[PDB]
From a paper:
Three Sso10a homologues are encoded on the S. solfataricus genome: Sso10a1, Sso10a2 and Sso10a3 (29–39% sequence identity and 55–62% sequence similarity). The structure of Sso10a1 reveals that it dimerises in solution via the formation of an anti-parallel coiled-coil structure. The domain at the end of the coiled-coil is believed to be involved in DNA-binding as it adopts a winged helix-turn-helix (wHTH) motif. Based on our findings we conclude that the Sso10a proteins function as chromatin proteins; they bind DNA with high affinity, and display different architectural properties (DNA bending, bridging and stiffening).
Dimerization occurs through an anti-parallel coiled-coil interaction of the α4-helix. A notable difference in the amino acid sequence of the three Sso10a proteins is that Sso10a2 contains four extra residues within the winged loop domain, not present in Sso10a1 and Sso10a3. The four extra amino acids at position 56–59 in Sso10a2 lead to an extended loop within the wing domain. Sso10a1 and Sso10a2 structures also differ in the orientation angle between the α3-helices. As the relative position and orientation of the two α3-helices is predicted to have an important influence on the DNA-binding mode, this could result in distinctly different DNA-binding properties for Sso10a1 and Sso10a2. Note that the Sso10a2 crystal structure suggests possible electrostatic interactions (K57-E59 and E59-K57) between the wings of adjacent dimers. Such interactions could underlie the observed DNA stiffening and the salt sensitivity of this process (see Discussion & Conclusions). The increase of RMS at high concentrations of Sso10a2 suggests that, besides bending and/or bridging, Sso10a2 has a second binding mode which leads to the formation of stiff protein-DNA filaments. The effect of NaCl concentration on the stiffening mode suggests that this binding mode is determined by electrostatic interactions between neighboring proteins.
Author numbering:
A (entry chain A), B (entry chain A): 7 to 104
């Protein structure tokens, strides 16, 4: 179960330099309805530019989009480290005396 | 607003080598009712030993307790890094075009 940040990451990392909807749906593992919503959001915040070529929508990652991809990646990796650190605390919160 | 892990950290870092209730209440910034609950938990999971000396309860951090303190500290620090990383993503999710 992915949140918004992570879906965006999964889109963006499949849109370098360009992506159509096939690449987005299959690369990010999201359906057409979800893809449409997020793509539109990413165009709005300037992470992707949109073109039509051969009657197909083509998205291109922007410099700002590359930075967004990098920052989400960094968030995800730290979040993983946080889960591990929490598990290490939890291991110490057991007892067999009681 | 602190969760359980963090309160425990705030107790433990004030119980080296020993702490009475004054040191726990004032050092961890928690009331007597909260302190009683957490102290009891920390004794149960083997992070503190409890003695009575001069009719006062004295708690001593154990080797396991020192490790618990260290691991919570590490959790807290990573959690802070996660907040910052999230803020950096958020900064990129704005637009003034719409």
């Amino acid at each position: 179960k992915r949140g918004t940040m992570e879906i965006m990451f999964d889109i963006l990392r499949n849109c370098e330099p360009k992506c159509g909807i096939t690449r987005v749906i299959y690369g990010a593992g999201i359906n057409y309805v979800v893809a449409q919503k997020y793509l539109d959001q990413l165009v709005k915040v300037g992470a992707l530019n949109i073109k039509t070529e051969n009657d197909r929508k083509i998205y291109e990652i922007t410099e700002k989009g590359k930075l967004l991809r990098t920052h989400i990646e960094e968030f995800i990796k730290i979040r993983e480290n946080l889960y591990s650190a929490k598990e290490k605390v939890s291991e110490l919160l057991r007892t067999d005396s009681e």
